Amino acid sequence: QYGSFCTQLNRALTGIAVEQDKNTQEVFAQVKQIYKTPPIKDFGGFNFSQILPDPSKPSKRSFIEDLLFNKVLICAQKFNGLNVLPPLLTDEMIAQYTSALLAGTITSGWTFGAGAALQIPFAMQMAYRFNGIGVTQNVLYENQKLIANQFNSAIGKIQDSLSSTASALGKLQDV
Protein backbone atom coordinates (compact mmCIF):
# COMPACT_ATOMS: atom_id res chain seq x y z
CA GLN A 1 0.00 0.00 0.00
CA TYR A 2 2.99 2.35 0.31
CA GLY A 3 3.36 2.81 -3.43
CA SER A 4 6.64 2.69 -5.32
CA PHE A 5 9.16 3.48 -2.62
CA CYS A 6 11.53 0.52 -3.05
CA THR A 7 11.95 1.20 -6.76
CA GLN A 8 13.31 4.70 -6.11
CA LEU A 9 15.92 3.37 -3.69
CA ASN A 10 17.01 0.60 -6.03
CA ARG A 11 17.30 3.04 -8.93
CA ALA A 12 19.43 5.41 -6.84
CA LEU A 13 21.76 2.68 -5.60
CA THR A 14 22.18 1.18 -9.06
CA GLY A 15 23.03 4.64 -10.34
CA ILE A 16 25.70 4.91 -7.65
CA ALA A 17 27.18 1.54 -8.63
CA VAL A 18 27.35 2.39 -12.33
CA GLU A 19 28.87 5.73 -11.37
CA GLN A 20 31.63 4.03 -9.38
CA ASP A 21 32.53 1.86 -12.36
CA LYS A 22 32.66 4.93 -14.60
CA ASN A 23 34.83 6.71 -12.02
CA THR A 24 37.52 4.05 -12.07
CA GLN A 25 37.30 3.80 -15.85
CA GLU A 26 37.85 7.54 -16.26
CA VAL A 27 40.66 7.80 -13.73
CA PHE A 28 42.79 4.90 -14.95
CA ALA A 29 41.97 4.15 -18.62
CA GLN A 30 43.74 7.21 -19.99
CA VAL A 31 45.84 5.01 -22.30
CA LYS A 32 44.77 2.90 -25.27
CA GLN A 33 47.68 0.51 -25.96
CA ILE A 34 49.38 -1.29 -23.08
CA TYR A 35 53.11 -0.61 -23.26
CA LYS A 36 55.80 -2.41 -21.28
CA THR A 37 59.40 -1.64 -20.43
CA PRO A 38 62.36 -3.17 -22.27
CA PRO A 39 64.21 -6.02 -20.53
CA ILE A 40 67.25 -3.82 -19.84
CA LYS A 41 67.33 -0.93 -17.35
CA ASP A 42 69.97 1.50 -18.73
CA PHE A 43 67.91 4.56 -17.62
CA GLY A 44 70.88 6.95 -17.52
CA GLY A 45 71.58 6.00 -13.92
CA PHE A 46 68.22 6.08 -12.13
CA ASN A 47 67.08 3.18 -9.93
CA PHE A 48 63.40 2.76 -10.81
CA SER A 49 63.34 -0.72 -9.28
CA GLN A 50 60.91 0.15 -6.48
CA ILE A 51 58.12 1.40 -8.73
CA LEU A 52 58.41 -0.99 -11.68
CA PRO A 53 56.58 -4.31 -11.27
CA ASP A 54 58.52 -7.24 -9.83
CA PRO A 55 58.19 -10.65 -11.55
CA SER A 56 59.09 -12.62 -8.41
CA LYS A 57 55.60 -12.12 -6.98
CA PRO A 58 52.17 -13.78 -7.33
CA SER A 59 50.59 -10.59 -8.66
CA LYS A 60 52.32 -8.04 -10.87
CA ARG A 61 52.07 -5.36 -8.17
CA SER A 62 55.27 -3.40 -7.62
CA PHE A 63 56.96 -2.83 -4.27
CA ILE A 64 55.36 0.46 -3.22
CA GLU A 65 51.94 -0.83 -4.25
CA ASP A 66 52.51 -3.93 -2.12
CA LEU A 67 53.45 -1.77 0.85
CA LEU A 68 50.33 0.37 0.44
CA PHE A 69 48.07 -2.67 0.07
CA ASN A 70 49.52 -4.17 3.24
CA LYS A 71 49.15 -0.85 5.07
CA VAL A 72 45.34 -0.76 5.04
CA LEU A 73 32.30 -9.17 8.66
CA ILE A 74 31.15 -9.90 5.12
CA CYS A 75 28.24 -12.12 6.20
CA ALA A 76 27.81 -10.23 9.49
CA GLN A 77 25.84 -7.43 7.83
CA LYS A 78 24.72 -9.70 4.96
CA PHE A 79 21.97 -11.48 6.95
CA ASN A 80 19.39 -8.93 5.85
CA GLY A 81 19.50 -8.46 2.10
CA LEU A 82 22.55 -6.19 2.12
CA ASN A 83 24.58 -7.55 -0.75
CA VAL A 84 27.81 -5.95 -1.94
CA LEU A 85 28.49 -6.22 -5.66
CA PRO A 86 32.06 -6.78 -6.82
CA PRO A 87 33.95 -4.09 -8.74
CA LEU A 88 34.16 -4.40 -12.49
CA LEU A 89 37.89 -3.95 -12.93
CA THR A 90 39.81 -6.47 -10.87
CA ASP A 91 42.65 -5.35 -8.63
CA GLU A 92 45.04 -6.93 -11.13
CA MET A 93 43.83 -5.07 -14.23
CA ILE A 94 44.18 -1.79 -12.35
CA ALA A 95 47.78 -2.74 -11.61
CA GLN A 96 48.18 -3.26 -15.38
CA TYR A 97 47.16 0.23 -16.50
CA THR A 98 49.53 1.66 -13.91
CA SER A 99 52.45 -0.41 -15.16
CA ALA A 100 51.69 0.94 -18.63
CA LEU A 101 51.64 4.62 -17.70
CA LEU A 102 54.92 4.11 -15.86
CA ALA A 103 56.40 2.32 -18.87
CA GLY A 104 55.23 4.97 -21.32
CA THR A 105 56.38 7.87 -19.16
CA ILE A 106 59.90 6.52 -18.74
CA THR A 107 60.66 5.58 -22.34
CA SER A 108 58.52 8.02 -24.36
CA GLY A 109 58.30 11.16 -22.23
CA TRP A 110 54.91 12.78 -22.73
CA THR A 111 54.40 12.38 -26.48
CA PHE A 112 52.43 9.17 -25.93
CA GLY A 113 49.42 11.09 -24.65
CA ALA A 114 48.91 12.86 -27.98
CA GLY A 115 49.64 10.30 -30.70
CA ALA A 116 51.69 7.12 -30.45
CA ALA A 117 54.75 6.46 -28.33
CA LEU A 118 58.00 8.04 -29.58
CA GLN A 119 61.32 6.59 -28.28
CA ILE A 120 63.55 9.14 -26.42
CA PRO A 121 66.68 8.47 -24.24
CA PHE A 122 65.69 9.25 -20.60
CA ALA A 123 68.83 11.31 -20.06
CA MET A 124 67.69 13.52 -22.93
CA GLN A 125 64.14 13.76 -21.63
CA MET A 126 64.78 15.48 -18.30
CA ALA A 127 66.88 17.98 -20.25
CA TYR A 128 63.61 19.04 -21.87
CA ARG A 129 61.77 19.01 -18.56
CA PHE A 130 64.26 21.47 -17.08
CA ASN A 131 64.14 23.57 -20.24
CA GLY A 132 60.48 24.23 -19.38
CA ILE A 133 61.22 25.73 -15.95
CA GLY A 134 63.92 28.16 -16.97
CA VAL A 135 67.24 26.44 -16.32
CA THR A 136 69.07 25.70 -19.55
CA GLN A 137 69.89 22.17 -20.67
CA ASN A 138 73.55 22.47 -19.67
CA VAL A 139 72.64 22.16 -15.99
CA LEU A 140 71.46 18.56 -16.35
CA TYR A 141 74.33 17.02 -18.30
CA GLU A 142 77.06 18.84 -16.39
CA ASN A 143 75.58 17.49 -13.14
CA GLN A 144 73.96 14.25 -14.30
CA LYS A 145 75.52 11.90 -11.76
CA LEU A 146 74.78 14.28 -8.88
CA ILE A 147 71.05 14.43 -9.64
CA ALA A 148 70.92 10.65 -9.98
CA ASN A 149 72.06 10.29 -6.37
CA GLN A 150 69.57 12.81 -4.99
CA PHE A 151 66.73 11.26 -6.97
CA ASN A 152 67.68 7.69 -6.03
CA SER A 153 68.06 8.71 -2.39
CA ALA A 154 64.72 10.54 -2.50
CA ILE A 155 62.83 7.31 -3.18
CA GLY A 156 64.83 5.79 -0.32
CA LYS A 157 63.14 7.86 2.37
CA ILE A 158 59.56 7.68 1.09
CA GLN A 159 59.61 3.89 1.38
CA ASP A 160 60.57 4.25 5.04
CA SER A 161 58.08 7.09 5.49
CA LEU A 162 55.18 4.80 4.60
CA SER A 163 56.55 1.81 6.51
CA SER A 164 56.97 3.88 9.70
CA THR A 165 53.46 4.95 10.77
CA ALA A 166 49.97 4.10 9.55
CA SER A 167 48.83 7.74 9.64
CA ALA A 168 50.18 8.38 6.12
CA LEU A 169 47.08 6.93 4.40
CA GLY A 170 44.53 8.83 6.47
CA LYS A 171 42.45 9.81 3.45
CA LEU A 172 41.59 6.34 2.13
CA GLN A 173 41.31 4.77 5.58
CA ASP A 174 38.61 7.30 6.43
CA VAL A 175 36.59 6.24 3.37
Partner: protein, 167 residues
Protein backbone atom coordinates in the same frame (compact mmCIF):
# COMPACT_ATOMS: atom_id res chain seq x y z
CA UNK B 1 33.59 -22.57 18.65
CA UNK B 2 33.09 -23.72 22.28
CA UNK B 3 30.89 -21.63 24.62
CA UNK B 4 30.89 -21.54 28.41
CA UNK B 5 28.89 -24.07 30.45
CA UNK B 6 25.98 -21.65 30.88
CA UNK B 7 26.17 -19.48 27.73
CA UNK B 8 23.54 -20.63 25.23
CA UNK B 9 23.71 -18.76 21.91
CA UNK B 10 26.11 -16.20 20.48
CA UNK B 11 25.86 -12.94 18.57
CA UNK B 12 27.97 -10.79 16.25
CA UNK B 13 29.08 -7.16 16.30
CA UNK B 14 25.62 -6.34 14.88
CA UNK B 15 23.73 -8.47 17.45
CA UNK B 16 22.50 -11.11 15.02
CA UNK B 17 22.13 -14.69 16.24
CA UNK B 18 24.98 -16.81 14.90
CA UNK B 19 25.44 -19.98 16.97
CA UNK B 20 23.15 -22.02 19.21
CA UNK B 21 23.32 -24.89 21.71
CA UNK B 22 21.12 -27.91 21.06
CA UNK B 23 18.80 -28.62 24.08
CA UNK B 24 18.59 -32.47 24.00
CA UNK B 25 22.35 -32.94 23.34
CA UNK B 26 24.74 -30.19 24.46
CA UNK B 27 26.13 -29.66 20.96
CA UNK B 28 26.91 -26.40 19.17
CA UNK B 29 25.39 -25.49 15.81
CA UNK B 30 26.01 -22.54 13.49
CA UNK B 31 23.20 -20.69 11.71
CA UNK B 32 23.79 -19.33 8.22
CA UNK B 33 20.92 -17.69 6.31
CA UNK B 34 19.90 -19.59 3.21
CA UNK B 35 20.98 -17.96 0.01
CA UNK B 36 19.48 -15.05 -1.88
CA UNK B 37 20.56 -12.94 -4.82
CA UNK B 38 19.50 -10.66 -7.61
CA UNK B 39 18.38 -12.27 -10.85
CA UNK B 40 19.64 -10.28 -13.82
CA UNK B 41 19.10 -10.50 -17.56
CA UNK B 42 21.78 -9.77 -20.15
CA UNK B 43 20.23 -9.13 -23.54
CA UNK B 44 21.20 -7.43 -26.84
CA UNK B 45 18.56 -5.22 -28.50
CA UNK B 46 15.08 -6.78 -28.91
CA UNK B 47 15.31 -5.69 -32.59
CA UNK B 48 18.62 -7.59 -32.99
CA UNK B 49 17.53 -10.84 -31.24
CA UNK B 50 15.46 -12.56 -28.49
CA UNK B 51 18.13 -14.73 -26.82
CA UNK B 52 18.92 -13.69 -23.24
CA UNK B 53 21.43 -14.87 -20.65
CA UNK B 54 20.46 -15.06 -16.99
CA UNK B 55 22.84 -14.11 -14.19
CA UNK B 56 22.38 -15.12 -10.57
CA UNK B 57 24.66 -13.01 -8.34
CA UNK B 58 26.53 -14.67 -5.44
CA UNK B 59 24.66 -18.00 -5.85
CA UNK B 60 26.57 -21.30 -6.29
CA UNK B 61 25.53 -22.97 -9.59
CA UNK B 62 24.63 -26.18 -7.68
CA UNK B 63 21.71 -24.44 -5.86
CA UNK B 64 20.54 -22.40 -8.92
CA UNK B 65 17.64 -24.74 -10.01
CA UNK B 66 25.20 -24.05 -20.46
CA UNK B 67 26.59 -22.83 -17.15
CA UNK B 68 29.73 -20.93 -16.02
CA UNK B 69 31.00 -19.81 -12.60
CA UNK B 70 32.29 -16.21 -12.62
CA UNK B 71 33.36 -14.35 -9.49
CA UNK B 72 30.17 -12.34 -10.00
CA UNK B 73 28.05 -15.47 -9.65
CA UNK B 74 26.42 -18.09 -11.84
CA UNK B 75 25.73 -17.25 -15.48
CA UNK B 76 23.49 -19.58 -17.48
CA UNK B 77 22.67 -19.10 -21.14
CA UNK B 78 26.08 -17.91 -22.33
CA UNK B 79 29.19 -19.70 -23.67
CA UNK B 80 32.74 -19.08 -22.33
CA UNK B 81 35.24 -18.01 -25.05
CA UNK B 82 39.04 -18.00 -24.44
CA UNK B 83 39.58 -15.10 -26.92
CA UNK B 84 39.43 -11.59 -25.32
CA UNK B 85 37.78 -8.48 -26.91
CA UNK B 86 36.56 -4.98 -26.00
CA UNK B 87 33.76 -4.92 -23.45
CA UNK B 88 30.18 -4.85 -24.73
CA UNK B 89 27.85 -5.53 -21.78
CA UNK B 90 29.90 -5.53 -18.56
CA UNK B 91 29.02 -8.11 -15.93
CA UNK B 92 31.45 -8.26 -13.03
CA UNK B 93 35.04 -8.89 -11.96
CA UNK B 94 36.40 -8.63 -15.48
CA UNK B 95 33.85 -10.53 -17.59
CA UNK B 96 32.10 -9.09 -20.64
CA UNK B 97 29.26 -10.55 -22.71
CA UNK B 98 28.35 -9.84 -26.32
CA UNK B 99 26.36 -11.18 -29.28
CA UNK B 100 28.57 -12.62 -32.01
CA UNK B 101 29.64 -16.03 -33.30
CA UNK B 102 24.04 -17.83 -36.24
CA UNK B 103 25.20 -15.99 -33.11
CA UNK B 104 25.12 -16.73 -29.40
CA UNK B 105 25.83 -14.80 -26.22
CA UNK B 106 29.55 -15.10 -25.50
CA UNK B 107 31.17 -14.36 -22.14
CA UNK B 108 34.89 -13.69 -21.98
CA UNK B 109 37.69 -12.12 -19.99
CA UNK B 110 37.86 -8.45 -20.96
CA UNK B 111 40.89 -7.22 -22.91
CA UNK B 112 42.71 -4.14 -21.66
CA UNK B 113 43.01 -2.72 -25.12
CA UNK B 114 45.65 -3.96 -27.52
CA UNK B 115 49.27 -4.72 -26.65
CA UNK B 116 52.33 -2.76 -27.74
CA UNK B 117 56.02 -2.46 -26.97
CA UNK B 118 58.52 0.30 -27.73
CA UNK B 119 62.25 0.11 -28.38
CA UNK B 120 63.98 2.35 -25.82
CA UNK B 121 67.77 2.68 -26.36
CA UNK B 122 70.70 4.84 -25.18
CA UNK B 123 70.69 6.63 -28.56
CA UNK B 124 67.37 6.34 -30.46
CA UNK B 125 65.00 9.30 -31.11
CA UNK B 126 61.93 8.96 -33.35
CA UNK B 127 61.10 12.36 -34.93
CA UNK B 128 57.65 12.47 -36.72
CA UNK B 129 57.55 13.74 -40.29
CA UNK B 130 53.90 14.16 -41.29
CA UNK B 131 50.88 15.48 -39.42
CA UNK B 132 47.09 15.33 -39.53
CA UNK B 133 44.37 17.64 -38.24
CA UNK B 134 41.41 16.06 -36.46
CA UNK B 135 38.09 17.27 -35.06
CA UNK B 136 36.78 15.76 -31.83
CA UNK B 137 33.47 16.57 -30.11
CA UNK B 138 32.03 16.46 -26.61
CA UNK B 139 28.78 17.47 -24.95
CA UNK B 140 28.21 19.07 -21.55
CA UNK B 141 24.73 19.51 -20.03
CA UNK B 142 24.13 23.06 -18.84
CA UNK B 143 20.60 23.46 -17.50
CA UNK B 144 17.88 21.03 -16.53
CA UNK B 145 14.20 21.92 -16.86
CA UNK B 146 12.89 24.70 -14.63
CA UNK B 147 9.83 23.59 -12.70
CA UNK B 148 7.59 24.60 -9.82
CA UNK B 149 5.09 22.71 -7.69
CA UNK B 150 2.60 24.27 -5.29
CA UNK B 151 1.88 22.11 -2.26
CA UNK B 152 -1.73 22.84 -1.35
CA UNK B 153 -3.02 21.79 -4.77
CA UNK B 154 -0.95 18.59 -4.82
CA UNK B 155 -1.51 17.33 -1.27
CA UNK B 156 -5.07 18.66 -1.06
CA UNK B 157 -7.62 18.34 -3.84
CA UNK B 158 -8.88 21.90 -3.32
CA UNK B 159 -11.15 21.19 -0.36
CA UNK B 160 -11.70 23.19 2.81
CA UNK B 161 -11.18 20.21 5.12
CA UNK B 162 -7.81 19.22 3.67
CA UNK B 163 -6.63 22.82 3.42
CA UNK B 164 -7.49 23.40 7.08
CA UNK B 165 -5.90 20.13 8.19
CA UNK B 166 -2.58 20.76 6.45
CA UNK B 167 -2.35 24.10 8.26
Amino acid sequence: KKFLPFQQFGRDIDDTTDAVRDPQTLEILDITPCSFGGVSVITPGTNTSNQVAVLYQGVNCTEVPNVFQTRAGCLIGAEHVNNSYECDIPIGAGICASYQTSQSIIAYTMSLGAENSVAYSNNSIAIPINFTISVTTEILPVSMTKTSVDCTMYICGDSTECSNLLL
